[PDB]
Amino acid sequence: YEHATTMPSQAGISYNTIVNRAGYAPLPISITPTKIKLIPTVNLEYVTCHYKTGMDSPAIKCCGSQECTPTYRPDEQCKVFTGVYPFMWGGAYCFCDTENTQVSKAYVMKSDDCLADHAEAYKAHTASVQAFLNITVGEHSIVTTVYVNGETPVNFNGVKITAGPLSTAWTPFDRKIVQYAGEIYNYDFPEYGAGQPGAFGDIQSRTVSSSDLYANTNLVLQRPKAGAIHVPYTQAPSGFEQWKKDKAPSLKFTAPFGCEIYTNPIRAENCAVGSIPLAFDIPDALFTRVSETPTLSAAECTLNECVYSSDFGGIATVKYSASKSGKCAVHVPSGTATLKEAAVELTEQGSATIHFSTANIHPEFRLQICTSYVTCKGDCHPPKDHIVTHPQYHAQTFTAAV
């Protein structure tokens, strides 16, 4: 039997329903998503880190000419400064006053700490939603991880569960993101091969172990001081450091819909966004006839207490006269009231207690119970505290009138 019902995509809050037919007893169904995960399809564009400016030892020729011998290292600068007269701890290096030459060259390379202190620049394409759910059908219970795509089923005990596509496809990650120190940032980093100096991406590598290294650090050499041996260089300050100094708070403190953000895998969890269109294919063999189950006759309902509140502040007693003692389900076919409990136990004729949370100030709802239903009605009072530390349990509704 094919049944389908939208389930609000809230983490920690439960959801209940009853599936029934003209000659088959109510079969309860309960769902509880303990963690809804939003993994995006992601690939690595590069990794960046602090640079370090390596530099070959100056090659000094005493009154002889030199040449800018080229090598091919990242962001290389090579220059042949003439008219030098260097000094060491032992005195003047050369005897010719003029015509001495010093060839000096400098280059960029990855910091020694880049293997463990680096930022990963990624592109995030599309979303994949998977949720850890607790599903019960007529006391057949399962705890699973369902891939929310409408395709992948979870088929334990013969009932086939399919969690349709997340109704409002949405991600907190833009197309192009960055990971650093276990925090995910939305940042339009330069494409590989366009990194500009003094900003994020000044040095880049396709992988942490990649041989290639593009560097654009605005490296330019200056002539050394007379009587000193060294390689002067003025360079744009490390763009990665500047990004660290100047960056907005991570998505874990700015993401919409209250999403939590985690980094392995890159993902967002507990996004209170949209709803999951669950579809349940219940086998014909799991249904039970109305005759077998406890049948209720001549029930009455009364709200012995009502506190219009986020939690289950509403209490109602049902006086029952059952045909045979046992257990059976209880529900409200309406968004007015959401029940804490799924089923109750009955002993011939007596009373039972139902907990619920409500939106209506003047509540009235049909409590469906054990192959019957009773019209519960009453007046309800406001709650105590202005602010509470948990999310809503009761479906909001327009009617809150006198």
Ligand SMILES: *[C@@H]1O[C@H](CO)[C@@H](O)[C@H](O)[C@H]1NC(C)=O
């Ligand atoms: C779901 O099942 C798991 C089983 O480990 C349990 O720990 C968790 O509390 C259950 N959640 C609810 C309230 O259904």
